[PDB]
Amino acid sequence: GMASSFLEEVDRLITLSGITFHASGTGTPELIKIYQDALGNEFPETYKLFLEKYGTLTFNGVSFYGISKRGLSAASIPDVKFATEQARTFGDINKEMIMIKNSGYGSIFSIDTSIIGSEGEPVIVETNLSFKDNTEKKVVANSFGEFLLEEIELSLTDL
Ligand SMILES: [Cl-]
């Protein structure tokens, strides 16, 4: 299914691609457990697969957050614990959301563990500057895996 074919597909696409993908490479089963416990969230299967294989992934300056090289000592994005804790402190996302991408000002992308898509995983939501005021979310992808594949596909057509 989608989750069992996810890593093969991402690799197939990175292989075809001639852009450089920057991956921390530092995700491990132990660190995945530690991040989930710290944030208070279960990570969806495609996100944990991504964490284990890539850790983080940045390409064309498009950055998908995760387990950075410094791990618990990360002091900036693209570490997902850093980003998520920070956003919660500032009210831009809540305790059920895991921040995974920030495409310029006022556009935050999260795994929403409270909103399930059609593949048994949490969807990706986009939230903006007024989230702390109105809590509105926009669904922008059916799962973490599908979101990442969509953005890598876009890189294969657009400069
Ligand atoms: Cl890193």
Q: Where are the domains of the chain?
A: 1-159
> CA torsion, points 65, 69, 73, 78, in degrees to nearest 10?
-20
**Cα 135 to ligand 1 centroid, rounded to whole Å:** 30
For ligand 1, the distance from its centroid to the CA atom of residue 152, given in whole angstroms, is: 19
3-state secondary structure 53-92: HCCCEEECCEEECECCCCHHHCCCCCEHHHHHHHHHHHCC
Which residues contact residue 156 at a Cβ distance below 8 angstroms, ignoring those fewer than 6 apart?
Answer: 13, 16, 17
Which amino acid would we find at residue 130?
A: S
| Helix 80-90 and helix 29-39, axial crossing angle in degrees, nearest 10 | 0
Distance 18 CA to ligand 1 centre (A): 21
- The amino acid that residue 128 corresponds to is N
Q: Name the β-bridge partners of 138.
A: 126
Closest Cα partner for 52 from 11, 24, 72? 24
CATH architecture of residue range(s) 1-159: 3-Layer(aba) Sandwich (3.40)
* Start-to-end Cα distance in the chain: 30
CA of 81 to the centre of ligand 1 (A): 12
CA distance 112 to 79: 17
Q: Is 26 helix (H, G, I), strand (E, B) or coil?
A: coil
Residue reference for tokens 């284990």: 52
Cα(134) to ligand 1 centroid in Å equals 33
> How many whole angstroms from 32 Cα to the centroid of ligand 1?
15
Within 10 Å of residue 93's Cβ, how many Cβ atoms? 24
Q: Cα–chain-centroid distance for residue 155? A: 17
Please report, for the chain, how many H helices and E strands are present, in that order: 6, 6
